[PDB]
Design a protein around this ligand. Structure first.
Ligand SMILES: O=c1ccn([C@@H]2O[C@H](COP(=O)(O)OP(=O)(O)O[C@H]3O[C@H](CO)[C@H](O)[C@H](O)[C@H]3O)[C@@H](O)[C@H]2O)c(=O)[nH]1
Ligand SMILES: [Mn+2]
Length: 272
């Protein structure tokens, strides 16, 4: 077998993405027979150099996940990636911690396979163009650059929210993501700050092929705006060395392998 082409020859470009249609994971599993237990997929015709672990922070978003799975699997296969889906479900009813869950994802996924690339994605963001490859690049990759919720514009040039990708080494070089951001906001700016502090830059696809749709939803109880985010992000320089991968603690309560993804339910503690 030879190395897959640089550009998948299966891409179709723009696609129609809509969320008023109800979904059935059974049909999805059927329509994607190539996807193995735990939502694992490995190209058959060639050797993909992208061993992608796709991490999804999660709690009470089953319907969104449904759409996410319905749309992404077909796309990730067309992108010729050797990938796996990880839904990191936060146990309990305490404050949501997106960044911490992503860290857990990084660690737990590595126990399964020698992934060298990590895509961190909100459960509610779907790419509108399969040319927007869910893989890693020479530099940290911001993937959801043109969100319809922001009218296809980047809210500000340093925005790193939504969907992003870091290679194993890029992730490691910044001591991962912070674990101290409880509730909504700022964790993505901290991560951006970490990348810059390590002397890295953000790579992005152009605003056309980077178009993506957000599933409209209301706010979630237990993920209210974090009032401390403003000055927490103003101090990333001093906290990234001690807050991150090296200080990550958590308890996996249960691991379940479904046909389209692996669900890891974890106790990641509470704000202190
Ligand atoms: O109860 C919750 C809360 C959050 N999430 C997960 O965390 C993500 C972000 O939460 P929301 O979609 O409510 O957040 P927003 O739409 O504001 O998302 C945007 O703002 C966030 C602020 O923390 C993040 O930066 C995120 O990546 C960015 O796209 C969700 O997609 C989902 O994957 C859950 O599963 N359950
Ligand atoms: Mn959202």
């Amino acid at each position: 077998l030879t190395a897959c082409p640089e550009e998948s020859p299966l891409l179709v470009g723009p696609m129609l993405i809509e969320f008023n249609i109800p979904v059935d994971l059974k049909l999805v599993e059927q329509q994607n027979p190539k996807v193995k237990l735990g939502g694992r997929y490995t190209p058959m015709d060639c050797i993909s150099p992208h061993k992608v672990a796709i991490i999804i922070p999660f709690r009470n978003r089953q319907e969104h996940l449904k759409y996410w799975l319905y749309y992404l699997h077909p796309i990730l296969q067309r992108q010729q990636l050797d990938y796996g889906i990880y839904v990191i479900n936060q146990a309990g009813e305490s404050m949501f911690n997106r960044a911490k869950l992503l860290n857990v994802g990084f660690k737990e996924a590595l126990k399964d396979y020698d992934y060298n690339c990590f895509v961190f994605s909100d459960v509610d963001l779907i790419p509108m163009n399969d040319h927007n490859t869910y893989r890693c690049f020479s530099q940290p990759r911001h993937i959801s650059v043109a969100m319809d919720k922001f009218g296809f514009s980047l809210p500000y040039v340093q925005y790193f929210g939504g969907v992003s990708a870091l290679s194993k080494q890029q992730f490691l070089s910044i001591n991962g993501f912070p674990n101290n951001y409880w509730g909504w906001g700022g964790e993505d700016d901290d991560i951006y700050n970490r990348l810059a502090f390590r002397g890295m830059s953000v790579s992005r696809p152009n605003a056309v092929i980077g178009k993506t749709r957000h599933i409209r939803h209301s706010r979630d109880k237990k993920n209210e705006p974090n009032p401390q985010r403003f000055d927490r992000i103003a101090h990333t320089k001093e906290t990234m060395l001690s807050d991150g991968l090296n200080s990550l603690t958590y308890m996996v309560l249960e691991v379940q392998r479904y046909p389209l993804y692996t669900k890891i339910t974890v106790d990641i503690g509470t704000p202190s």
